Amino acid sequence: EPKVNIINAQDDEVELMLSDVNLSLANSLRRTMLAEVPTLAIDLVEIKMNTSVLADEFISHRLGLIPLVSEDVEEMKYSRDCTCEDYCDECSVVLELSARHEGEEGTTDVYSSSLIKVSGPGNLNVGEPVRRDDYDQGILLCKLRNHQELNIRCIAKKGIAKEHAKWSPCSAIAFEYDPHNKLKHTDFWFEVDAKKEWPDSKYATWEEPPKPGEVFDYKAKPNRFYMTVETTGSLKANQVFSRGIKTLQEKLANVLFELENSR
Template sequence: MVKKSSQADFLFPSNEILMKEEVVLNTYDDCTDYVEFDDTADYNIEKYRDDIQIEIINESKDGMTLEFDLTRVEAPIANALRRILIAEVPTMALEKIYLYQNTSVIQDEVLCHRLGLLPLKVDPRQFQFPLTKTIGINEQGVDCDEEPEGDPKRNLIFKINVTCTKNRNAIPTATDPKQLFHHSSVYSRAFEWVPIGEEQANELQGENKPRMVSPDILVAKLRPGQEIEASCHAVKGIGRDHAKFSPVATASYRLLPTIRLHAEISGEAAERLKSSFSEGVIAIEKKGAKKIAVVKDARKDTCSRNVFRHEDLAKVVQLGRNKQHFIFSVESTGALRSNDLVVEACKVMQLKCRSLRKQVEELLG
């Protein structure tokens, strides 16, 4: 049963997107992107800064995944933070692969590309960016005649040397390659970090020791007689240049859903309302002898708008999204903890703002 409301059209806050059956309304802000803009009042950056709120909602034990709420800001700022997380927070990745031997079925260039995508457990803040982006190619089309020593302030070196051999002790009925051969599968654990000089060896020890994020990443499969030998040089870079430098597997946000019930919904209608949303969004509570529907947790709503399939419910249910409330989800690839990545992204944004301000001042001065 749906108890009718006396209002024909329901008012909604200006900071919310209104979701109808087939359209979305109020997707823009009046005059400016600044929340509650008043052109008669002076803009106060301190007040705006103090209004911004960040709340940690969930963080995994290993710190690799993080969910937090960013409120009282506009979409351009939230989206800038997301884009910086993906493309402009530096990490270390394998850039130059000096391949000495590769008799596997994987082509040299494909193998080198695959190695470059292996995530490294290295703090990029301890290193500097490379002085040159590329190494010049000589007349024979070779970019170097021999492997360079590497710069301890700019490089890390990982070496791998794996050869597949037959297992002489395998049982006669064995069919699994892991039982028939030694090193039939090459995993990321096969890479060994080689320090560049004593200073790097002394500084990068214990928790700071460079390594692969996971030892169980499958790199290649070998058969007896096949071999992979390579020396891999890592450099500092950003995801804007290549995806292998991106520090996040996921960096996304969504607006906080809002659900308003403008009438009392009970009985069979309450059950239909509950089934129209994701589990946990709508709850059934007792009110005297009746069971009525209440909004339990709008955060879990996926904004499917299934409720508009029911004509009676569509008249009293208002769906929206808060334009000032961003639910961020960040998943690190492993180089740094997710909360550290958010802090580093804010630092990058701060540097960009200072640079822009300096250029504007020089232009106006």
């Protein structure tokens, strides 16, 4: 019954036609991808030493805000699950940055490229700093001036956006359906008229404008929805879609497993 028709797809985004499904189901899946997608971000930030002008916790926070290539996050265990004393390579990853500005004048702009995958549960393609482009140094991290050195060693761990928004893989995920308010699910505010005062939905083309004399059908229901699946770059919009679906599926399977086991 469920249907998919990609209108526009991209690495970061997937914009598709999801129809023949429920409003509640679409919202639940959107929530699944947005919050219920485990990912990997800088978590344990540890300073061997610092000389910059910013609060160590501030830098740590900005570091956590860094999306990391998380293709194989599906594979690496949560740190909590692993029984090894302290961490091991199979339950966390080791990166390091260590930037120094030399020269009495100037300012060394530390970049995420300076972050480097020191370790990680190889050969998992994880822990790689995400970048628009290889020539793209990445996100500007820090500015080091005369006699300002920076040495740090961090540890990241797989987690979910529910735990902290840094794990949010999707930069944004919109939603709509029935742009013409055919279902009349909203009352349009206006002074003279909603029509001449309200713009038109970008997806309005997909649904005809209701006829003037057409009588309202109270059997009308939300069927065709509209979507664009943005990713912050740590993962692909297609991978994000599939992995969120798989996470919902695993949650349901676990729920039914509990249904049978508790009985």
